[PDB]
Design a protein around this ligand. Sequence first.
Ligand code: NA
Ligand code: NA
Lengths: 404, 404, 77, 77
Amino acid sequence: KRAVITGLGIVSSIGNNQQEVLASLREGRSGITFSQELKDSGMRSHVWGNVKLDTTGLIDRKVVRFMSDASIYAFLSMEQAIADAGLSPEAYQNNPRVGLIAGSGGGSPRFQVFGADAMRGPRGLKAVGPYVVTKAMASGVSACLATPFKIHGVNYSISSACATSAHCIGNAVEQIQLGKQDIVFAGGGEELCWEMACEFDAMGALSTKYNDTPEKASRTYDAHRDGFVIAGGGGMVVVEELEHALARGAHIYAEIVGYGATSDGADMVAPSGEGAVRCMKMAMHGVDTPIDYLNSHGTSTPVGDVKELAAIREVFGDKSPAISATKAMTGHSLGAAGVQEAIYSLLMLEHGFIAPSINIEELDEQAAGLNIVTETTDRELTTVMSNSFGFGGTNATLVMRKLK
Amino acid sequence: KRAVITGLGIVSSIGNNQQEVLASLREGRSGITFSQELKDSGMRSHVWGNVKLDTTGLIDRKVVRFMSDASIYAFLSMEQAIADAGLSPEAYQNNPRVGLIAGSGGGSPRFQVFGADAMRGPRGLKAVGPYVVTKAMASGVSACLATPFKIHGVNYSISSACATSAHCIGNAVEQIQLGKQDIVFAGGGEELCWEMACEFDAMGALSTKYNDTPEKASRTYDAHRDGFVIAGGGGMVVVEELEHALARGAHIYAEIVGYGATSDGADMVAPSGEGAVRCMKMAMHGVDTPIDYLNSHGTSTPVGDVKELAAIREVFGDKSPAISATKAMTGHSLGAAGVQEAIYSLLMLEHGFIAPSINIEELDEQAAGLNIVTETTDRELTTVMSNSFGFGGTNATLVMRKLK
Amino acid sequence: STIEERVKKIIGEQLGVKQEEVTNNASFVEDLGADSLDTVELVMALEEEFDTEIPDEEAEKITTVQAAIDYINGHQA
Amino acid sequence: STIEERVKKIIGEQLGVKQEEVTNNASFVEDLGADSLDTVELVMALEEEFDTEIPDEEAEKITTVQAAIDYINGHQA
Ligand code: NA
Ligand code: NA
């Protein structure tokens, strides 16, 4: 009934594996670049957190034919997690005790518009192709991955906006907790395209007044934050039952000692804080050790960061933990943010440092009195927490602690 | 902890409430009509299971502005489920013990195309609007419903192709079993449009021969089937902890005594049967009662109906239950199929009858030996089972039994 | 109707409030219960009614009804 | 280049096989490992490289490599 993380895999804007990520994290390296695609589409935001990798040919033809970018990123991330966990094919394939729970925030808007343009084109149905469904559907990530990896256990996608892959992890923990699975791969992926980004721009949610300086467009907790920078990528962690991981001598990053999942039920687009307070308290219940580091949701938005800060204050009071918003470096990978920021927290827990919250040239007045780390700091971490909030008032909180 | 279905609501192709649905279930009425919109797009399938309902004015403006049709169907189904459960706002709103797990297959392809045409149109970003994200996101159903109903408990969407709302129900039961929730609203919805149907037509998975005879297109287990008929709609059931339902004197349709969720791990689009075999046996675990009725997946497709039939043989053998494919008259509502078939099964269990599997003119040669029901039959049922299978080889099975 | 009655007609048409509530003094967020997404859609309809173009910096300051009449009374040539 | 070598280029790339493994008598399913959805995508790439429609029917008769090579030249209607 105790769940541990035994394998990591990440393809993000600051690294194509956990080593490259570890280097970017220690150095405060931004992953945000200028996007000619976002400018050509007619958007105001011309910056994004792209994946610096040419995935062309990296996956077998009969597998990638069904995949969008969200499935490609998550497939690459699961391959890393499988090798990092030390799982041989006979150890996890064709195993009813082995499942997979990975989702995306919104499928694949690109291939969805492609099929519509193809359907309305000169060729019509002839130009659509038989693979648009698996790419565009919301469960494309879990479905495109469970088939080649021969997953026999649990298999579905969870969707909850930017809490997506965080809820995947918590749901994977629950499957372990009630004995239904020994291993669940949890994570997610998100494509990066104008078809998806321009719809956030139409709401005024994207950073638009830093296109000439992309590496400081995402500036969480800075007084002059303009909105979030959209990002893509994927991530996958190996959630395993404790004694099952001990019996096979696996490497154990941390134990999932807490998982919160609540809802605001108030507003659709702006958080309320009350839900996040319950979500954090829910994830800290029964955790005897204090929280050393908190990877906040911090999205570099005017209203988003102050509400979570108020929630952090009410939860911890005066004994506020070390806070850092990695989204200032990575951007917002939406559906993939929960798993990626859990991986960042695990790297910080495993290697004993705290990644900095960059681009804070002027700390927001509503952030004083907190321990917001702005310079890379070596520190022996024992318990870390990561928040993930999504549209509709949905909240997710993960607490991870070192073993023994 | 034991979970029971305490209320239900449905907007189906065969009725806009459980009364109308029951009238079509006992009668074997087809919900499938000719579709002109499917012609004008250039499809080969001119046949769908549409919702016959004028939804104008049924939802507040400040609430429906965020919703696609999938969210609209699920909202109207959740309104019915709340009233049918006898719940007032003071018992389920602003309650951390009350959650909502409802998803769809792929958000809203229609509004994704709308935003792209608007972005590439004359006005560009000015024409997109700020409401396309909540309509296009994969968790639009759970997001657009959690805010108006003031949900404070768990809140996210599960997506797993045509097993979507079935997994949503099983996850709700898991939430009650863990003791984290007293009530979870579970269900889902699906919009019905050419932008989403034409992609199943490019796969050759839709019925295209019986366009001039729409009520005969969906013909599960018939030797002349042509593929499934796409449908839309929504459903919602009130999953509640037993003692909580007994303490307030709720009406209890049945108890969720089994839940199966497996994966084939073999083929991306064609089922293998081995996974369905493990999925049905996982749900029958601890069920002392024989299965009296089985609501098969029954997609009226050439390959899927045979593999599920062989799976049913391998689990029962001689003690086969009465089998009916409701999709023969309702069609395939995809993301909402799971909760709708669970409701159909609940109505049969509640009113002691079995709905027929219609249009079986020449029975399939591989049916042989399985008591298919082709005419309505009154029968005292106590235990009922419903199967739901999705792309990527993902399976979901529910077992519902009358209480006491 | 006139330019002000047209302006007063379209906001209440989009804000679910009656024409007696949309006062020249009233603001969208405080008195009329509108959020940020409501004001965005309100600008869009204002561009359709008068067939005009409203920059985002000009649409930032139309925080009240009087600011909406003042802008329409100066962009129509 | 010749017509035949252009359809073999399509089959080899769409199915992921070496060019000289695409013999004329090779079956798409039995020899080239193609499934259902590979067939639909295969007839699409023929319409893109060349400039003819293959109104179904023919598409279902094309089970081998030679069947495609015959219909890319022995038709054009
Ligand atoms: Na976080
Ligand atoms: Na069923």
